Amino acid sequence: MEYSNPVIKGFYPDPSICRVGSDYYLVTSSFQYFPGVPIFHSTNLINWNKIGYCLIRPSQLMLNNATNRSGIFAPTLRYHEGIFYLITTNVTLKKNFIVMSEDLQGEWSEPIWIDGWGGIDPSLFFDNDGKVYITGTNDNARGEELGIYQAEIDLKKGSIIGERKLIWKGTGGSYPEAPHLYKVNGWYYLLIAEGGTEYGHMVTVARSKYPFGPFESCPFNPILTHRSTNHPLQAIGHADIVQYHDGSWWAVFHGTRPISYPPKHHLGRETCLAPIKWTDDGWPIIGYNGRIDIKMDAGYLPVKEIIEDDFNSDIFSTDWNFIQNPRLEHYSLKGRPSWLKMRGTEKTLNDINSPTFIGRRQEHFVCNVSTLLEFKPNQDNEEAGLTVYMNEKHHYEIALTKKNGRINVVLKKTVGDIQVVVNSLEYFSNTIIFSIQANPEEYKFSFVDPNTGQTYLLGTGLTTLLSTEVAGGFTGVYFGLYATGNGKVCTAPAFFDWFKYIPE
Amino acid sequence: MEYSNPVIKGFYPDPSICRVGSDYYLVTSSFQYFPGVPIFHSTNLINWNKIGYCLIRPSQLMLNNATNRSGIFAPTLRYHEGIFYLITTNVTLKKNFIVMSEDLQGEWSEPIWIDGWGGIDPSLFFDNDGKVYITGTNDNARGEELGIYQAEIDLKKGSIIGERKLIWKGTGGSYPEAPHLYKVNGWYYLLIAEGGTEYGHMVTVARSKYPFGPFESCPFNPILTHRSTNHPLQAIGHADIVQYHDGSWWAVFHGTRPISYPPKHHLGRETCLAPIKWTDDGWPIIGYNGRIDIKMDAGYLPVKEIIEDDFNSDIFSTDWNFIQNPRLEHYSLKGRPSWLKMRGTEKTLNDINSPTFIGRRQEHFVCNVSTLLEFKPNQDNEEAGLTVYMNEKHHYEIALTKKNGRINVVLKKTVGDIQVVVNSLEYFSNTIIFSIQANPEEYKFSFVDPNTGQTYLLGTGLTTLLSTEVAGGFTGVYFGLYATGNGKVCTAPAFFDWFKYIPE
Ligand SMILES: [Ca+2]
Ligand SMILES: [Ca+2]
């Protein structure tokens, strides 16, 4: 049997995995998007169902001033004695914290803020002697030597016990990070990422008889990397290991699927899966001697996408994210039942601080995305539509707007410091269907007059100008519904009847 | 004593070096630019003076349809018994050839086309038994196994003797290339690049008692790389070795100086220098155990930039390049003595096939570039100015033009599929000074009214949208003087009095 990588497509980076019996749970980083820290469930490591998010309340997730360069970085999920612990960093606040749950269908706890624990990529390990260890990166604010730091932690108090200790510098790659401590067959293993989460990314491992070291570098490090290859999967690393309930070992990690030359990726970092074999002399090797592929053998894992939202429920589906904490009063599923009613503010897609926007990840290179919008702009500033969005300086939109008394459908782009209206056609009714056809190299923007079914191609845009390499930050493209008054509050409400995401 | 890398700043990739006595010569790749294959001279490996170009005649350099993805790829320069051999690939033609010279102040020979020798990165080695070997990459047209291929060559005939043989696959990095064969202390060494000329770039070496192998991989390969580091120098490789006349060994190679995040570079790949030490057991190691720095120790090398062209000579300076083979009739240094007179054609900066353009490399992150232009456009299509140019889809320009009867100074950008006029101001005289201030993140476009000395900032543009990562291809930014009639021949001549390049 085979499976395909990525196992979780689209923007799902920094996967951390946790087994409870014959169930598996996985979390990913979310940066400036709300809610934060998606959590998935699987019984076979290949097929994952999103069960919700870990950070859903303002008290857990403070994203004011957060961007696709900041907000929530790598999360780690662990389970001990019936309690789940999610530990992560809000980089906008420069603070590490934990939330807890004993019931994954309910919400997680208020955060426990870990004072005097800096850096990113915090992780937890529960030892057999009752001690709990927190492990993370160097803290740049304190001018620490680059490497992996660890201390004992008191989980109730949110406090460190004893001293914060450098335990391993890694093999000499940049940005030694993503540390996880495990104990397997009498050895402590410290698994990390080096080289940065770009084309240099790799996984390395060390081991020790003691949890604080000294750690011996694996002699065949790195144990996973596509650096210096032209494989379709790149930037592979940030791994977390699991022993499946049949006894076999596996790693989850992320990688990208870049296109063009030089390589550029727009679907974010995507979660992948590979087997682990343990060498006779006690070291893990991931995949096919440190490499992986799009098609992989499933071992004995038991092997087993069109999304249409009609907005019929008064609860938002788990596909939807907002930019930072949303202004809840500007989105309503009750004002017009069976529609989403949005109130645009002065903020636009060029502003970081929560414009009126709701979006879902692009998870496929080839897909068709559409929405029906009712919008009668009252004044020239007023605008609502459908966006392909990377960050505040990299986004394309097709929208209804008003200029000099006339209603126009427009195609608008922001790329870096360039803001352009690419095309504009007069439009003569109150409802419109917007559709975007994505392929690897371009998005094609069309509108349909609902009353006739006639489609019109308004224009096109390059995927590569929305790529992470171009745009900056740590995220993937979203498709979003938005409204704005372009420096004033938007007096016309925007009503979206439905949203469709149809992958090829 | 110290020196700084890069030793040759700006777009100077794929350096090949050749010693003749106490003189050193070095060549670089030039892609679609004319003339082709710059050649430099040094006596100390650190300071290089450009002495001209190797490919200066249409018979040597056929660049019709060439782009910054094609044209002339890596050159190799060798010397035997008073004759210099320059061997390279015109990738637009998919052909390898050699030109020869016995006098570097004169022009090189007509090409000898090497029939049935495919791939890129051809190199020559003259053995002590009188045999000459050609070495290069796999030929994708023939579905060859990836690796380094070699044969004996008859240099007079331009023909291969005997069989084309795969001699080494490399260590397992992508794109094994840049092969050079040497013979040192009884071993044949095969030095190559792997990983691609981007963030995976590295140098590896193998050795054999025989020129065709079998080759043993160096046990500490790679011997040079910045992969998986955050060093300011990246993408390092494509090395060629020299023994300096004091007996010490050195490598030249290229690397980039990227900025922003993810890393993006706009100055091209730049030539660097590092020492070699030979291990007791007969392997070379480059630099500081396989890494290098911006400041390096000069060993015993004897250690030792404002450019102003007034156009007073009827010979173009060696700074100037054209896009492909120029239409010579459209550039004149004689029509108005002490000025460059250019005739714009229907072709624009968006067209690959030789628009009227002359340019010089950006060689510094911080510099000020200016020109005085006399231009009285006769019709609305007509345009002349100063460009910052990466390729046909990535360039910014400040220019004089005409629209609806009125003369305007404009700032124009092409980025991918976006073509925009960023700003436009009416202008009321026949001469103008254009100036661009570059810094690492942005170019600032100003014009001066020559008659008053008053400067005006017309606008700005991001360096990152001209970077190779964004734009594609294999080159660095140029600053150019251009004219165009935007689909018609430009009826107004453009006269440039001078050009200044003032680095910080
Ligand atoms: Ca509906
Ligand atoms: Ca002059």
Interface touch B415/A469, C-beta < 8 Å: no
B199 in Cβ contact with A199 (< 8 Å): yes
A255 Cβ under 8 Å from any chain B Cβ: no
How many Å lie between the centroid of ligand 1 and the Cα of residue B346? 53
Q: Is A30 annotated as a binding residue?
A: no
Residue A267: phi, psi to the nearest 5? -95, 10
Instruction: List the domain boundaries for chain A.
Output: 1-305, 306-504
Pairwise CA distance, residues B211 & B165, whole Å:
11
* Paired tokens of A28: 């990913």
Cβ atoms < 10 Å from Cβ of A281: 6
Pairwise CA distance, residues B392 & B397, whole Å:
12
- Residue carrying the six token digits 């460009």: B387
Q: Which amino acid is at B210?
A: Y
In the PDB record, what is the listed experimental method?
A: X-ray
Alpha-carbon distance B351 to nearest alpha carbon in chain A (angstroms): 19
* Helix (H/G/I), strand (E/B), else coil: A204: strand
Write the residue in A195, A201, A228 that is nearest to B173 by C-beta: A228
Cβ atoms < 10 Å from Cβ of A105: 7
Q: Are strands B270-278 and B249-256 parallel, antiparallel or unpaired?
A: antiparallel
A76 in Cβ contact with A122 (< 8 Å): yes
H or E element: which one contains A207?
A: strand A202-208
* Paired tokens of A181: 């401590």
DSSP A107: P
Among the listed residues B269, B202, B294, B277, the one whose alpha carbon sits nearest the alpha carbon of residue A195: B202
Pairwise CA distance, residues A13 & A29, whole Å:
6
* Helix (H/G/I), strand (E/B), else coil: B466: helix
Question: B174: which chain A residues are within 8 Å (Cβ-Cβ)?
Answer: 228-230
- Burial of B219 from C-beta contacts in 10 A (0-12 / 13-18 / 19+): exposed
Residues paired with A357 in a beta bridge: A482
Pairwise CA distance, residues A463 & A86, whole Å:
34
Distances (CA, A) of B28 to A262, A414, B12, B31, B276: 21, 37, 5, 10, 21
If phi > 0 it is left, if psi is from -120 to 50 it is alpha, else beta; for residue B466 that is alpha
Interface touch A195/B227, C-beta < 8 Å: yes
Interface touch A422/B418, C-beta < 8 Å: yes
Write the residue in B199, B262, B418 that is nearest to A418 by C-beta: B418
Residue A68: phi, psi to the nearest 5? -70, 0
Q: Which amino acid is at B270?
A: E
Pairwise CA distance, residues A150 & B238, whole Å:
41
* Paired tokens of A160: 């460190």
Alpha-carbon distance A472 to nearest alpha carbon in chain B (angstroms): 6
H or E element: which one contains B470?
A: helix B468-471
Residue A476: phi, psi to the nearest 5? -115, 170
Cβ atoms < 10 Å from Cβ of A293: 16
* Homologous superfamily (CATH) for A1-305: Glycosyl hydrolase domain; family 43 (2.115.10.20)
DSSP A171: S
Write the residue in A227, A418, A465 that is nearest to B227 by C-beta: A227
CA angle A123, A126, A127 (to 5 degrees): 130
* Paired tokens of A335: 């004002």
Q: What is the DSSP string of B170-187?
A: -SS-SS-EEEEEEEETTE
Q: Which of A121, A177, A309, A382 is catalytic?
A: A177
How many Å lie between the centroid of ligand 2 and the Cα of residue B342? 14
B295 in Cβ contact with B2 (< 8 Å): yes
Cβ atoms < 10 Å from Cβ of A154: 11
- Burial of A488 from C-beta contacts in 10 A (0-12 / 13-18 / 19+): middle
* Paired tokens of B317: 């300076």
Q: Is A109 annotated as a binding residue?
A: no
Question: B262: which chain A residues are within 8 Å (Cβ-Cβ)?
Answer: 198, 468-469, 472
Alpha-carbon distance B137 to nearest alpha carbon in chain A (angstroms): 16
* Paired tokens of B429: 């005289």
Cα B231 from chain centroid (whole Å)? 22
* Helix (H/G/I), strand (E/B), else coil: B241: strand
Question: A470: which chain B residues are within 8 Å (Cβ-Cβ)?
Answer: 464-465, 469-470
How many Å lie between the centroid of ligand 1 and the Cα of residue A447? 18
Residue B141: phi, psi to the nearest 5? -65, -30
Q: What is the dihedral of CA A8, A55, A347, A313, to 10 degrees?
A: 80
- Residue carrying the six token digits 């352009």: A420
Pairwise CA distance, residues A173 & A161, whole Å:
29
B466 in Cβ contact with B396 (< 8 Å): yes
| Strand order across the B16-20 sheet | B16-20, B23-27, B36-42, B49-55
| Strand order across the A234-243 sheet | A234-243, A249-256, A270-278, A284-286
Interface touch B200/A198, C-beta < 8 Å: no
Distances (CA, A) of B41 to B18, B19, B227: 10, 10, 30
Chosen from A192, A199, A462, A467 to mutate, greatest number of chain B CBs within 10 A:
A199
Q: Are strands A331-332 and A340-342 parallel, antiparallel or unpaired?
A: antiparallel
Q: Is B338 annotated as a binding residue?
A: yes
B186 in Cβ contact with B248 (< 8 Å): no
Per the annotation, the verdict on B14 as an active-site residue is yes
CA angle A295, B470, A72 (to 5 degrees): 65
Interface touch A227/B200, C-beta < 8 Å: yes
CATH no. of A306-504: 2.60.120.200
A338 in Cβ contact with A312 (< 8 Å): yes
Residue B262: phi, psi to the nearest 5? -60, 160
Pairwise CA distance, residues A114 & A123, whole Å:
12
Q: Which amino acid is at A43?
A: T
Which parts of B35-158 are beta strand (E)?
36-42, 49-55, 76-80, 83-90, 95-101, 112-113, 123-126, 132-137, 148-154
* Paired tokens of A233: 């999967």
Q: B297: Cβ–Cβ under 8 A, 6 or more apart, which residues?
A: B1, B2, B275
Per the annotation, the verdict on A177 as an active-site residue is yes
Distances (CA, A) of B255 to A229, B32, B206, B234, B259: 18, 20, 22, 5, 13
H or E element: which one contains A4?
A: strand A2-4
* Helix (H/G/I), strand (E/B), else coil: A330: helix
Q: What is the 3-state secondary structure (H, E, C) of A263-306?
A: CECCCCCEEEEEEEEECCCCCEEECECCECCCEEECCCCCCCCC
A173 Cβ under 8 Å from any chain B Cβ: yes
Alpha-carbon distance B64 to nearest alpha carbon in chain A (angstroms): 22
Pairwise CA distance, residues A408 & B106, whole Å:
64
B306 Cβ under 8 Å from any chain A Cβ: no
Q: B365: Cβ–Cβ under 8 A, 6 or more apart, which residues?
A: B257, B259, B267, B438, B439, B440, B504
Write the residue in A228, A260, A462 that is nearest to B202 by C-beta: A228
Q: Are strands B148-154 and B132-137 parallel, antiparallel or unpaired?
A: antiparallel
Pairwise CA distance, residues B488 & B383, whole Å:
11
What residue spans of A339-495 are helical by DSSP H?
A: 468-471
H or E element: which one contains A431?
A: strand A431-438
CA atoms within 13 A of residue B303's CA, in its CB half-sphere: 10
| Strand order across the B95-101 sheet | B76-80, B83-90, B95-101, B112-113
Q: Are strands B36-42 and B49-55 parallel, antiparallel or unpaired?
A: antiparallel
Residues paired with B483 in a beta bridge: B356, B384
DSSP A464: G
B112 in Cβ contact with B98 (< 8 Å): yes
